[PDB]
């Protein structure tokens, strides 16, 4: 199919050598991605540990602040507070891949009659504020780990695809071109035999 010259054989040997370098380079890329994956999974463990312990703190704080107190007054203390929008995001570009990570403002300026009429909901409210800080921390850890995982999936199917597809196809074209060029050299070393035979059948015609 492709034009069978000795130049094209060299181009095919060059691209076989480039794909064989590419298998090594992309395996090394996968190794660096696995290194940071296992650097992040134990951070995910520690983040889940801190999240559950601060979760237990805020849960016990709300248990005390609505068991020793009024459900109607925690209703009024919740609904007096505005919903407090303002969480924002920034951008990670690494290995090309891009995810937004977030952090929150969480304003404390809403000191709504700052002599707080129950003795407990300031304590429980700051417990839930620390709870939400730990939650957005676990969220950023989660999205970083998912990006690393899907990129290792990409690199694994890329290495497997490149190896199994475009190593043997290029090997097949190199063998095709080598065998047709050997046919041409065999026709040359036949035709030279005949022209030597029919120059030396001239001394034998004297």
């Amino acid at each position: 199919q492709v034009s069978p010259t000795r130049m094209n054989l060299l181009q095919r040997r060059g691209q076989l050598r480039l794909a064989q370098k590419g298998v090594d380079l992309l395996k090394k890329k996968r190794d660096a991605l696995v290194a940071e994956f296992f650097g992040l999974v134990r951070e995910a463990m520690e983040a889940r540990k801190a999240l559950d312990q601060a979760a237990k703190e805020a849960y016990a704080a709300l248990l005390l602040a609505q068991a020793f107190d009024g459900p109607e007054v925690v209703a009024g203390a919740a609904l007096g507070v505005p919903p407090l929008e303002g969480v924002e995001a920034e951008v990670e570009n690494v290995w090309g891949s891009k995810v937004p990570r977030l952090k929150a403002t969480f304003p404390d300026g809403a000191l709504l009659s700052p002599v707080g009429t129950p003795a407990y909901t300031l304590e429980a409210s700051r417990a839930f504020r620390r709870y939400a800080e730990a939650l957005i921390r676990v969220a950023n850890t989660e999205t970083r780990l998912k990006k690393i995982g899907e990129e290792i999936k990409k690199t694994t199917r890329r290495v497997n695809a490149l190896e199994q597809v475009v190593i043997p196809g290029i090997r097949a074209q190199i063998r095709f071109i080598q065998q047709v060029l050997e046919q041409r050299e065999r026709e040359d070393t036949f035709r030279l035999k005949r022209i030597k035979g029919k120059i030396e059948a001239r001394e034998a015609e004297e």
Binding site: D24, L25, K28, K29, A32, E36, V94, W95
Partner: protein, 107 residues
Amino acid sequence: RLMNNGVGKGKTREDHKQVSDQLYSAYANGVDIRKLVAIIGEDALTENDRRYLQFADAFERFFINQGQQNRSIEESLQIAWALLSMLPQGELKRISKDHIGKYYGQK
């Protein structure tokens, strides 16, 4: 082929073959880490690998970039140890500590 018969005890210098293998493996894993750093970045490796990257990049202009000076065998092994000093001791995992403690360290 014959290098293993031409270096050693009273031939040129007794630590020769081990430095030969060590320079080979160190430039071998300097080249491909220098090629990988294009798609990951300078600041997203380990630390000894960036030492290997600096070693290879300075190796191919202090050791191969000879120019024209009549470089003797002791001077060339001396500069080979000055290049090996930029790798950390202990990471040189082809040489026993006799020639390490004797020769290594000096840039």
